[PDB]
């Protein structure tokens, strides 16, 4: 369920990203945990920068971030979302 990104449906992953973006947590520790989990799941080189330091012209809204992750994994031979 939270072991790998293939365990997440795209809608579920967007829920995770939306929670992070809105800092919808009860403590900083909880937010750091979610960000660390996001990094581990995506395996993307930019790590948390995908969320906090977007590249010029990137959609950094939760949906934009999911799309960037989706496209990157597909283009880099990695498994995608469940279903």
């Amino acid at each position: 369920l939270k072991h790998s990104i293939s365990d997440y449906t795209e809608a579920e992953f967007l829920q995770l990203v939306t929670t992070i973006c809105n800092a919808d947590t009860s403590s900083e520790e909880e937010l750091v945990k979610l960000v660390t989990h996001f990094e581990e799941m995506t395996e993307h080189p930019s790590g948390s920068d995908l969320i906090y330091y977007p590249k010029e012209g990137d959609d950094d809204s939760p949906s934009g971030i999911v799309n960037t992750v989706k496209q990157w994994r597909a283009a880099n031979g990695k498994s995608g979302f469940k279903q």
Binding site: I20, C21, N22, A23, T25, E28, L31, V32, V35, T36, S46, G47, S48, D49, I51, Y52, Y53, P54, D60
Partner: protein, 131 residues
Amino acid sequence: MESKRNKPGKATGKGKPVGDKWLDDAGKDSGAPIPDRIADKLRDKEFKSFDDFRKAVWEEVSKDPELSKNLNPSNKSSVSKGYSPFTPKNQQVGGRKVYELHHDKPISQGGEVYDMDNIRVTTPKRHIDIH
């Protein structure tokens, strides 16, 4: 009589003028100073612990247009809750991923806990490279 950073005290100090690269300075030298703008807002207020002071600094940054205009929407959501903002990936180290507040003259060596002129903002990497 334990941990000095957990005893209440009033914030003091002037801070320094800062600009658009305030947080970038946190990854260099001895880190960035507490902005004079923030110092004016916290001065004379009493805090129960250093962690409560830390929370107040980030909450004030979230309400300061100059100091926050440099944080994206997601980082803005974090500081608005009193959390420290995340640093760029290249400045993180292990589980340390957010900007840190540290005492220039250590508290264990007589540095004042709530003296804003004795506090610096650093990235995890800079704090490590310094020591």
